Amino acid sequence: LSLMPWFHGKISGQEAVQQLQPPEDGLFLVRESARHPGDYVLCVSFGRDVIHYRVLHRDGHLTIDEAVFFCNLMDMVEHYSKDKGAICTKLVRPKRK
Numbered sequence: 001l002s003l004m005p006w007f008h009g010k011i012s013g014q015e016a017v018q019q020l021q022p023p024e025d026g027l028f029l030v031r032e033s034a035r036h037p038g039d040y041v042l043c044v045s046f047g048r049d050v051i052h053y054r055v056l057h058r059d060g061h062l063t064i065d066e067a068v069f070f071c072n073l074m075d076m077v078e079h080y081s082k083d084k085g086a087i088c089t090k091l092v093r094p095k096r097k
Contacts, residue, residue, distance in 0.1 A: 001073060006030055006094035013052065016043040019095050023048040026092025030055070030073060040073065042080075046088040053087060 001007055008016065011031045020027055023045050033039040033054065040055035042064065053064045055076070061069035062076055065086035070076040081091040 004030075004074065004077075004094075005096045006077060007073070008095075008097045010034070013041070013043075016041070016052075017050045019043075020045045020050050024093065026089050027095055028077075028091045028093070029095040029097075030077070042076075042087075044087065044089065044091060051088050 006029050008019070008029050008031045012034070016029060016031050019029060020043060025046055027045040029043050031041050031043065033041055036054070039057065042053040042055055044051050055062050055064055055073070058066065058069060061071060062073060063069045068085060070079065077091055079085070080087055084090045
């Protein structure tokens with residue numbers, strides 16, 4: 001996870017929105033949640049906006065939609081790069097840190 005190009009660690013929501021400019025559909029990053037210790041936020045550029053998804057923990061697993069769960073963030077990002085599922089658009093380019 002420390003080696004993931006899309007993982008920006010402890011950056012704020014405002015810093016994440018600034019990182020995802022100029023808008024590019026599917027441009028994305030993952031950050032750590034400050035208000036929810038241990039949780040994450042997946043930030044994705046869509047329709048010139050930045051959409052934020054809280055990544056929750058359920059039974060040790062990770063989830064955005066509480067329908068599909070993953071063991072780790074890497075499997076979650078690989079999934080949402082193949083099909084958008086519950087999120088607005090597929091993950092395409094990782095915004096590098």
